[PDB]
Amino acid sequence: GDERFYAEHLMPTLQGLLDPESAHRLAVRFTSLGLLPFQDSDMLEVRVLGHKFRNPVGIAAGFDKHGEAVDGLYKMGFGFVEIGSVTPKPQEGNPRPRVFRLPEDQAVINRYGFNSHGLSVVEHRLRARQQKQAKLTEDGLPLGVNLGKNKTSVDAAEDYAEGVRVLGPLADYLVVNVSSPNTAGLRSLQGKAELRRLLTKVLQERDGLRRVHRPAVLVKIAPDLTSQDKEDIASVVKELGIDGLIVTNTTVSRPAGLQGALRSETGGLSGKPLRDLSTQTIREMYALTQGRVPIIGVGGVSSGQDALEKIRAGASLVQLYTALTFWGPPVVGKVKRELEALLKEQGFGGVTDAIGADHRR
């Protein structure tokens, strides 16, 4: 496993031979079979959400939408895996092309639209390795399951409720994904009244599961929220005792300076141009929740510094996806190695010590 080789030769050649969706599909395939190219120190261990995480670097939702490559992803060095988004019924998503690379920006735009094998398929896939996962979790490698809703559903809350009932028993944590920019009307569920109603139902359904099968519940939010939106989300989270937040999904904004020819494609923008917008959203949400609500920080993480900035801003854990598509699997070890070195350099005894450090200076 060599960073230079992947960054300079393998990935650019892959990007030059296949379209983005094809590259994604082949990657899931390769990862699922364990055809892949760092020893986690105690400094990187985090205890949150009722679990030990051997390192704080996870794979973000969207890469493994259907739970096909979980074990290969742990082998890649991720401290936790999130699969999904999964919808109740199977659905195809948007017509192709629906994924676009912006190499000049180290960015991606996608409009997949919740292409999903559906709950039943994912349920059986996870059941086939349920005890293996139980041991992985105990060993500090938890599993998250990200829930979406069907395009033609009349009752959004019931979609998420069904997700809780079916995949909740198989997950260490669940994500109520109300932040995809690619499903019409979905982001409106972030509004105060809609969110409270939705999350009340979700939490009731979760509380009804047997104790060993009872996951933490997190809400994944957009980077495009107004100050009022963020205030309201913070209020509802505290009112209902939501276990955590995932911050953030992709942006519908197109920051000044984007160079990629494909910058004006419809969809969610990810990668470097999203990075600081996400970090600032983490920072705001941490403050609004008084540091009492665990945050998983996501968006434009490609290095140790990127990870630590989100951690200092208030994230207990981080995730990446887009960086993997540019630098390949070696980015995981790179992020962890750089993060460890930076923690030492900045006087932190571990990740835990650095969580929210910016707010205390």
Ligand SMILES: Cc1cc2nc3c(=O)[nH]c(=O)nc-3n(C[C@H](O)[C@H](O)[C@H](O)COP(=O)(O)O)c2cc1C
């Ligand atoms: C191709 C693609 C598909 C994605 N699909 C999902 C999804 O199904 N559910 C979800 O919550 N986030 C999804 N995401 C968003 C990521 O989980 C993450 O929040 C975002 O991409 C920012 O992280 P990054 O810059 O490291 O990619 C997707 C992102 C991309 C790149």
Ligand SMILES: C/C(O)=C(\C#N)C(=O)Nc1ccc(-c2ccccc2)cc1
């Ligand atoms: C949307 C998406 O996943 C991509 C694009 N564009 C993409 O390139 N993904 C990807 C992710 C991982 C890998 C990879 C490369 C080597 C070994 C295992 C996996 C290759 C490609």
Ligand SMILES: O=C(O)c1cc(=O)[nH]c(=O)[nH]1
């Ligand atoms: O299109 C999707 O499936 C999707 C894309 C994205 O960026 N975020 C998300 O939650 N879903």
